């Protein structure tokens, strides 16, 4: 009588390649780069980089324009996915309750450094 469309898939793929642009995931800054900022996602092989245009925009509006820190929580959303998991495109869209910390031990470097800045 009437056709039928299969709902969900039998066996989930959840593959680094199966990923789709639009998923909200909370990432943490691993290190500060000259071209952008590295975001921790917890994956082997997959690298996530953030553009200075988006990163600087969030920092300027957040840290009134001030360098970020390590292991710091930063909002990021998948905008594009690479074929061979080469480079991932992240962008600031919104935060989410879901958040996990990535630390094996307690250690931090606190240095009271100052410099030029305009308000």
Curated annotation (Swiss-Prot):
The gene is PDCD11. It comes from Homo sapiens (Human). Disulfide bonds: none annotated. Essential for the generation of mature 18S rRNA, specifically necessary for cleavages at sites A0, 1 and 2 of the 47S precursor. Directly interacts with U3 snoRNA. Involved in the biogenesis of rRNA. This is Protein RRP5 homolog. Transmembrane segments: none annotated. It comes from the Eukaryota. It is found in: Nucleus, Nucleolus. Interacts with NF-kappa-B p50/NFKB1 and NF-kappa-B p65/RELA. Residues 22-93 form the S1 motif domain.
């Amino acid at each position: 009588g009437s056709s039928g469309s299969s709902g969900k898939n039998v066996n989930r793929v959840l593959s680094a390649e199966a990923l789709k642009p639009g998923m909200l995931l909370t990432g943490t800054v691993s290190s500060l780069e000259d071209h952008g900022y590295l975001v921790d996602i917890g994956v082997d092989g997959t690298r996530a980089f953030l553009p200075l245009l988006k990163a600087q925009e969030y920092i300027r509006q957040k840290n009134k324009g001030a360098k970020l820190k390590v292991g710091q929580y930063l909002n990021c959303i998948v905008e594009k996915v690479k074929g061979n998991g080469g480079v991932v495109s992240l962008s600031v869209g919104h935060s989410e309750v879901s958040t996990a910390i990535a630390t094996e031990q307690q250690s931090w470097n606190l240095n009271n450094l100052s410099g030029p800045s305009s308000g």
